[PDB]
Symmetry: C3
Subunit: 297 residues, 3 copies
């Protein structure tokens, strides 16, 4: 597989191999090694249609630490799909660089980019999904809980791109995934069915978060968005009361950025069971392993 567009475009064995490599390279850098430079002489164009801190800094820093140079093409720099068609961007950037990262709106834009690029394309968020975030989240779970297999992950909030990539992961690792979301804001039926097709994981969609969280290893949230949404999502804030219902085993996770007072409270974000900051770090370690894999290392 040339590209990393969705986690279940790979098989179980490949995903676990990449998560093992993630731990190895992370250990190497944590040791202070700065002389492992597999990407010496390689470049990455990073196309960003939207703002970013974690995706941007993790990819640019990681590429640097492994010996390469990443270019930051911001929203107004190349304007993929408006100034210029995606197939043309793909064919140009594939002749300058060795790998392309892209954060876009319509998922089809990243499919187009991958289809027309002769180099690997890595997804850095689309309207549909966010696979590198969940790869990081899996690494974070392995480090804190010990493994992803047989855990209960409960996402509370909008049935959105994060939920889509949780479903991707549930398609290659057997665990229990629940999406507790307001009626009308459920994840894509097709994406839910594709996870069920894999037959590994117990997949539940519910509108009752207070029940869903019971026994969770992970309570996950993200931004909901719109004053209508605020109205629709009353009852879906992750607060200390909800974490108490979830139980003493439960970690709190959030891809960030977080809007305290909306989808989550300050008390939850700052609590000892919150692992949002190690989670954010692990974007760089998971993606380093992903890029290594795509480039034949």
């Amino acid at each position: 597989l040339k590209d990393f567009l969705a986690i279940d475009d790979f098989d179980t064995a490949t995903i676990k191999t990449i998560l093992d490599k993630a731990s190895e390279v992370k250990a190497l850098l944590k040791s202070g090694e700065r002389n492992y430079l597999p990407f010496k002489g390689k470049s990455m164009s990073m196309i960003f249609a939207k703002p970013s801190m974690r995706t941007r800094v993790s990819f640019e820093t990681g590429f640097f630490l492994l010996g390469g140079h990443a270019l930051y093409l911001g929203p107004n720099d190349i304007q993929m799909g408006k100034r210029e068609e995606t197939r043309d961007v793909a064919r140009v950037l594939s002749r300058y660089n060795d790998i392309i990262m892209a954060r876009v709106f319509a998922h089809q834009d990243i499919l187009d980019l991958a289809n027309y690029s002769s180099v690997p394309v890595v997804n850095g968020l689309t309207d549909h999904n966010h696979p590198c975030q969940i790869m990081a989240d899996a690494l974070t779970m392995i480090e804190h809980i010990g493994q992803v297999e047989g855990t209960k992950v409960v996402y509370v909030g909008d049935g959105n791109n994060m939920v889509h990539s949780w479903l991707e992961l549930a398609s290659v690792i057997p665990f229990h995934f629940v999406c507790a979301c307001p009626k009308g804001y459920e994840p894509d039926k097709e994406r839910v069915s594709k996870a069920k097709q894999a037959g590994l994981s117990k997949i539940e969609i519910t509108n009752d978060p207070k029940e869903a969280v019971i026994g969770a290893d992970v309570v996950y949230s993200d931004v909901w968005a719109a004053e209508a949404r605020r109205k629709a999502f009353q009852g879906f804030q992750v607060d200390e009361a909800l974490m108490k219902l979830a139980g003493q085993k439960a970690y709190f996770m959030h891809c960030l950025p977080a809007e305290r007072g909306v989808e989550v409270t300050n008390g939850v974000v700052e609590a000892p069971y919150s692992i949002v900051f190690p989670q954010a770090e692990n974007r760089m370690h998971a993606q380093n392993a992903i890029m290594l894999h795509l480039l034949g290392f």
Copy 2:
């Protein structure tokens, strides 16, 4: 000469030497060599007044591949000519960096930048011209046709910056250059006359594209960019598959990009086997690496 602002600021021999080095260094990189790093310890500030993919990525990637660091100063980062006068930007950046690349509006802003900079200034496109693009074009022609000398290049569209740098090249290499443009949209008379003064090339301005393309080695286009009067005038100047058939069997299609299919050119032409727009785009990096090597004494 300190700067690279126009191709015919240099003589024929020097231009040909740059294009030879472009080939050599391209071949080195294609071999997989990453240990020729003459720009180690060197920096380049890249001032961009406008959006860019090709110029941006080619300059920044190539500078990296040769060992240096290029800074991207976007349109809102330093705001040359608005937040700060060009003479002051030139004198500050010349003290930080080893070379400056600039994409601006008024040509005079690039001349000012060069005049007050103690380091070399490279032109990354102005209102007047686009010399690094045509250097890359020349490399592409050498690779596909064999040579630039003795060819017939026919540009179809607005008599604009790309035409100006075609006229620059025609001042230093002898070939046949035809600009087929709507009446009213001719290139600058002084630039046309400057090419003719050099006496190397046959230079024609015409408003009949269907006659102009006959026997071309290259048919070249660019985005056209009262709006209604212009729309009217450019009827007949789209490069379509019919025009390429009139051009003949030895014609390549070139376009500096971005292309707007359905405007200056059709999908079928851009994607045709005779279209060399993607190799052309790559060669921005290789031509510009040779230019920068020259300017910094390599």
Copy 3:
């Protein structure tokens, strides 16, 4: 001290050591040495809430010349304080990078950034001050005059962030600092008082620029809507003011300069104007600051 937020968060000896190292590393680079790379394997996130040429290019280029990679986070990239709270930005970037630079609006934003960052934070300008600029200015003065101690520095203009960082310097090196500012455009009373408490420098706030400049070693300006124009009548640095200052006076301006507003063309381009060497020294002072913060 983890961070570089204000010059007088450090003592006199440490500031002098930093300025000494600034000279040494500048000499090394001027020699053509490109093999001193202490920042190999290190990264710096640079958060910019506002446009910049000198701060941006000096930090990005100098971090490169010392072996590291600086990331340019522009105003719309992370939107610190709008898309996401400073304490969260701090905690995330501290896990990716080795050092953070930040140019912000409210000074409290850079204090919050430092308080929640486990890595050093360098100030690249706030509404309150601009310490890296004055460190560069101090280097420039050492190279042109010989030293900062015992000089007379006269700032003419708005009592702003530049004046605040001058008062910071006047708290750790003994010199004579005058701010000639319009009434109601004085620097912060607390910042003046803190410099006087240090007891090293003679510090004067005046409204009479023609008298203040007399005998200066340095006449300093910076960029200063309609009503404000009225109050700054008499505060422009022109050739006549520089004549009053006398033959010892250099002109300095942190830039960008708006000729015809706070300064004339003739002053900016005069032989006594050292604005361009001044700007270069942003890189050399900041290199030494970053070396200090990172334990070199």
